[PDB]
Every structure is written in C-alpha cells, then in structure tokens.
Write a protein that binds this ligand. Structure first.
Ligand SMILES: Nc1ccn([C@@H]2O[C@@H](COP(=O)(O)OP(=O)(O)OP(=O)(O)O)[C@@H](O)[C@H]2O)c(=O)n1
Ligand SMILES: [Mg+2]
Lengths: 334, 319
C-alpha cells in the first residue's frame, strides 16, 4: 500500500522559489520529434483502407455466415491503430475476432482463407498475402498489414483442450486486448496522452534499459503521467514527459510499491509485477540516469535528435563541467 | 509496511542517540545557563529601576531534540528590547559569571565574541560542552526590512548579519516544534539521516536546516502516518525524483519573507552527486539492503530529549 513520491501529487508542498525556466525549445522539440515518429498521410490511407476492407468482410461474415462452417460471434478493433498511437515504419493494425466455437488451428486457417479470398474477389488487381500464425492469421498489402488475433467466448475457455485448441494464453491475451482497447478509448483518448505514449515507445527503443516495459504498461504509464493529478487537467507534454522519468526514478515500478493497478483485471493487480526484480532495478536506474541527464539540458540527446544515446546510461558523461555517473545495478541475485 | 526496515532504522537510531550521561550533562548546563541568565536579567532590571533583556530561548539541536552521540555544541538565543551593543554584551558576560554561582558550583569558562555577537560557555567535563548564547533583537530585522525597502531610518552595535541569523534560527526552532515534532517518524528519521550526512561527505551540504525541511516536506506530504522505515524511504524517493537538481523547485524556506531556497548554496555538481547517491540508496533499500545505506550489518515518545525550560517556559502538529 506504499505510494512512492510524486511531485505532481503534492505540488503545493513545494512552492517555487523562482519562475519556472523557459522550456520552449524542449516543448517545441517534443512536437518536432513526434512529427517524425507519426505515420505519414500515405501510411494512414493504407492501413485505413486495408482495415476497413477486412472489418466489413468479418462483419458480414457474422450476420449471414451462409453455408460457412465457422461461426464468428464478434470483432473489435484494438491496438495502436484504434488507440491512435501508431508509428511511422510499423504500418500494422490489430483486430480481435471472437469465435463461438472452440478455436482450432484448422478453423483459424479456414477463416483467414475465407476473408482474404473474398478480398481478392472484390479487387483482383490488389495483391494480398495471407499467412497464419500462433495468435491467429494476418493479411498484408504492399503498404500495410493487419493482424487478426483469434479468440473465443468465456464459456469455451473452461472447455478448451491443449491438443486441438489454441493455447489458453493466446486466447485470453486476445480477450485482454479488447479490454485494454475499451478502457483506453474511455480514459486515455486525450491529445497529449497519445503523443506521449508514442514518444515513450521510441524512448524504450533507444534505451535498452526500458526493454522490459510492455506496451500495456506504456499506456497506463503515459496516462498516469498526463491525467492523474489533484487538478482534473491534463499536464503539458513537456511536464508529463519529465514526470514519466521522475516517477520511474522514485521507484513507481519497484518492490513494495503499489505502482499502477491494472484497470482491466481483478482485483488489484500491479502491472509491473510482470517484470523480474532484476528488470525492475534496471527500468528504475535507467530512468534515474535520464532524470539527471534531462536536468543538465540534454533533451535532444534523450529524444533521439542527436543520434545514438544509449551510451548516456552506461558511460560517464560531462554536461557543461558537471560529471555525470550513470546509476548502477543494486539488485543482488540469490 | 517494511517491518525489517523499521527494525533497522530504529536500531541505527539507538546507536546514534545520546547517552543518559550526555543528556544529563546537557540538561544541567542549559538549566544553569537559563537560571543564570534569568538572574542576569533581574539584576539589570532592578539595577535600572533606580524589560531590557526580553527572554532566553532554546534553538538548534537542543530545541529540536536533534542531539546525537558525540555532540558538544549547544545554542541559545538572548532577545533584547533594543539592538544589542558591544556594551550590553560585556555587561551580560560579567554578570553571568557571577549569577552562575547562585545556582551551581560547577566551573564555566566564559568568552565573549563581539564579532560573533554571542557569548560562549564551556564546562570542565571531558570532552567539554560548549553552549553559545546569541544576542539579538527583533528591532534588527525590523530595520533590515526597512533598509531593503529603501526606507529612511549607539556607536557599538553588534554585527547585524549575525543578529539576523540568530532571529532566523529562533524562527526555525518554533517552526520545527510546530511542524516537524508532531509528524510521526520525522524526528527519528532526521537524526538517522543527520548521521548519514556526516558519515558521507556527499550528503554533507544537506546537513542541518535543509535536511530538516526535506524530511518534513517528504514525510508530511504522505497521505497517512508512516513508520521510520517507510518514512525514510519516502525521503529517498523524494530526493531521487531530482527535487534538488538545478531546474527543480528547490526547497522553499518557510521561515523567510523574501522567497528563499534552503539548498540555494549547493552548486551544480553537489546537486548532481546527492541525487545520484539518493537514487542508488533508494533501490538498495527497495531491494532489501537498507542496512548498507545506514552503515550497519543486517540484524539477525522518542522526540523529547530534555525537559522544556522551567525558567523560560507548546504548539503541536494537529493529531
Ligand atoms: N500478449 C498480449 C498481447 C496483447 N495484449 C493486448 O493487446 C496489445 C496490443 O497489441 P500489441 O501489438 O502487443 O501492442 P500495440 O498496441 O499494437 O502497439 P504497437 O502496434 O505499436 O506495437 C496490448 O495493447 C494489450 O492491450 C496483451 O495484453 N497481451
Ligand atoms: Mg499494432
């Protein structure tokens, strides 16, 4: 039940001695970096088109399955596509399909076929590739991809078998993707919030220390940063971005902390407990190093506007005369 | 929450807590100096009536109950109706030498520091206790205030700067008794951390008024009462967030009219270093190695140090 320190949870108790500094360049650079990461007009049109085409086919399939063997109960758009946190370069969208029958590898393939086949009949000129996977199946154009995460209905989960029906792990992670999608669209659909989650993905990709951080965790974190605060008002991008580092540094996702509770589970599950102690130490001290680096005015480096910076969190660096030593491991295996 | 941490913090606490022998000694010296000065006052009032010395107040460690094993420096504030002058300084010192004999036979060295606007008293124990009496007057700040505001206004007046500092510490005393004392585990943690600031040169610059503020701010902002273990952690978490870094908010001095930073002296590197240290100290504590931070081996009403003056005889942090 321990809540780690968070300056923006008790801002009143820390009166400012002098007017906040002019973080105009930092804020401007924050947006600049976002424009670079945000999908272009072509990518949006691509994934749009492809997702639109497929979703309809599935929709249709539900109502008038006709002489078709696989009964689909429902379909729901999920993932960055729906959340609005996609990234240039990764033009992939996600859709979860709920089957009324127990999901078999054979039905999954039968379905993937019916869909793609019906897409190639409505537009033979459009080259499409369809491949099945562990999760379900996937259809990709030359410009964009769509992953169909195949699941089932709760009642079946209890009746599922490990030899003929997909793994209960995959089936339930799909179901969770739905919840996450809903929750997000009901609580996280704020401009800055989305812009932050995008930047968070990038940060995690350019600092190997943030690697254990899952996407769901990045959503919940990006939300907390902007929205969770006494005053029912979203924080500025620059303020919530620095706060992301600050809360990780104060050990939000460390042992003994309540961290962040999963809104899409029961009853009170700590999201970060998907990470190992070793990883928790890492996420923390990585964030700690960046907090200090940021205070010394290295937002460009920390944003990826000055090339490779992963070294900033493992090697000594000197910022205007101040010698910076990266925070070091403190966890002790058995 | 964090039971072992409670154990270890409290254990390290004992290690640093004065000795019944030490406290008994401090109690007597202060009790003598108070009764003595009180007598020095009466003598002056009567000697005049044929008010000048307004009162004797406790400050610093003695007031705040922040004495630790190995402390020899005690402090007291003598308020005057007027700005204290070199003359008054002498008058007091000499009569103090005398008025002492009215309450005790223990020998006390007495030395006045006109340049320090105070009088030092030393006992004859080994090692010796040293009580400093700072002379000041509210008039000194009143005028300074006017001075700053560019407002119009004896030959041997004591250093104004020093005097302002005495008034300042008196404020800090009252503040601490009203804000910190009542706050659970604040005092315990301040002592235990005062020890850390001494053992580790890096935490050096934090020692004193800053550290006291830090602890009250971080512990007090909790949504609930904490044990010594949890409370201390929360002080590390606060430090780790970069609260003291240059572009941070700084520590706002609750005892100054013109907005002042309590850690304003810390240069860039010092800030960097403390943060880096506190950040590491946190995770250590988080991963069950708090004893390393405290400087100990893993184990297998603490506020009142000396009774309040009967000569110059209390607010408390709301339940
Ligand atoms: N093993 C999984 C897989 C998915 N999900 C849910 O569905 C995921 C969404 O798809 P994923 O590709 O894993 O993350 P994206 O949101 O798609 O992010 P990006 O497309 O940028 O990689 C997560 O959001 C999560 O809500 C999950 O909980 N557990
Ligand atoms: Mg996706």
């Amino acid at each position: 039940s321990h809540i780690p320190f968070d300056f923006y949870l008790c801002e009143m108790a820390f009166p400012r001695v002098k007017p906040a500094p002019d973080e105009t360049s930092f804020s401007e650079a924050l947006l600049k970096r976002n424009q670079d990461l945000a999908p272009n007009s072509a990518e949006q049109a691509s994934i749009l088109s492809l997702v639109t085409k497929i979703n309809n086919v599935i929709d249709n399939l539900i109502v008038a399955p006709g002489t078709f063997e696989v009964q689909i109960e429902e379909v729901r758009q999920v993932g960055s596509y729906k959340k609005g946190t996609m990234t240039t370069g990764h033009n992939v969208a996600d859709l979860v399909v709920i089957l009324k029958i127990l999901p078999t590898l054979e039905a999954v393939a039968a379905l993937g076929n019916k869909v793609v086949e019906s897409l190639r009949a409505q537009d033979p000129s459009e080259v499409l590739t369809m491949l099945t996977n562990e999760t379900g199946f996937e259809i990709s154009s030359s410009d964009a991809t769509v992953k169909i995460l195949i699941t089932t209905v709760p009642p079946n989960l209890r009746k599922l078998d490990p030899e003929l029906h997909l793994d209960i792990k995959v089936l339930q992670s799909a179901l969770a993707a739905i919840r996450h999608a809903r929750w997000f669209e009901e609580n996280a659909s704020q401009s800055t919030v989305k812009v932050l989650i995008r930047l968070l993905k990038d940060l995690r990709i350019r600092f190997p220390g943030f690697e254990p951080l899952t996407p769901w965790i990045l959503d919940l974190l990006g939300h907390y940063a902007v929205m969770n605060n006494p005053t029912r008002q979203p924080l500025a991008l620059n303020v919530a971005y620095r706060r992301c580092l600050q809360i990780l540094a104060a050990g939000l996702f460390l042992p003994g902390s309540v961290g962040i509770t999963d809104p899409c589970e029961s009853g009170n599950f700590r999201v970060h407990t998907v990470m190992t102690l070793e990883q928790q130490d890492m996420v923390c001290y990585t964030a700690q190093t960046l907090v200090r680096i940021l205070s010394h005015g290295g937002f460009r480096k920390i944003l990826g506007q000055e090339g490779d910076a992963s070294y900033l969190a493992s090697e000594i660096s000197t910022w205007d005369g101040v010698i910076v030593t990266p925070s070091e491991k403190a966890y002790e295996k058995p | 929450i964090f039971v072992n941490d409670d154990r270890h913090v409290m254990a390290k606490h004992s290690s640093v807590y004065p000795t019944q022998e030490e406290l008994e000694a401090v109690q007597n010296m202060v009790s003598h100096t108070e009764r003595a000065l009180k007598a020095v006052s009466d003598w002056i009032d009567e000697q005049e009536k044929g008010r000048t010395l307004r009162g004797v107040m406790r400050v610093g460690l003695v007031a705040k109950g922040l004495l630790l094993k190995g402390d020899l420096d005690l402090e007291l504030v003598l308020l005057c109706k007027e700005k204290p002058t070199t003359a008054l300084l002498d008058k007091v010192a000499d009569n103090l030498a005398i008025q002492l004999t009215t309450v005790t036979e223990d020998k006390y060295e007495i030395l006045q520091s006109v340049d320090d606007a105070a009088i030092v008293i030393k006992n004859t124990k080994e090692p010796p206790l040293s009580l400093t009496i700072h002379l000041t007057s509210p008039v000194v700040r009143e005028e300074m205030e006017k001075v700053l505001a560019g407002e119009t206004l004896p030959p041997d007046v004591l250093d104004r700067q020093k005097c302002l500092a005495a008034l300042a510490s008196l404020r800090h005393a009252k503040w601490f008794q009203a804000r910190a004392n009542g706050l659970k585990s604040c005092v315990i943690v301040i002592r235990v951390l005062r020890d850390l600031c001494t053992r580790v040169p890096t935490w050096g610059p934090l020692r004193g008024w800053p550290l006291e503020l830090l602890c009250e701010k971080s512990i007090g902002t909790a949504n609930r009462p904490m044990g010594a273990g949890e409370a201390l952690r929360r002080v590390l978490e606060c430090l780790a967030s970069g609260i003291v870094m240059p572009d941070g908010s700084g520590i706002y001095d609750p005892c100054e009219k013109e907005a002042t930073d309590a850690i304003g002296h810390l240069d860039r590197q010092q800030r960097e270093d403390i943060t880096q240290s506190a950040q590491h100290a946190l995770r250590l504590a988080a991963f069950g190695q708090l004893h390393k931070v405290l400087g100990m081996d893993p184990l297998p009403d603490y506020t009142v140090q000396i009774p309040p003056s009967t000569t110059y005889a209390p607010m408390k942090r709301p339940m």
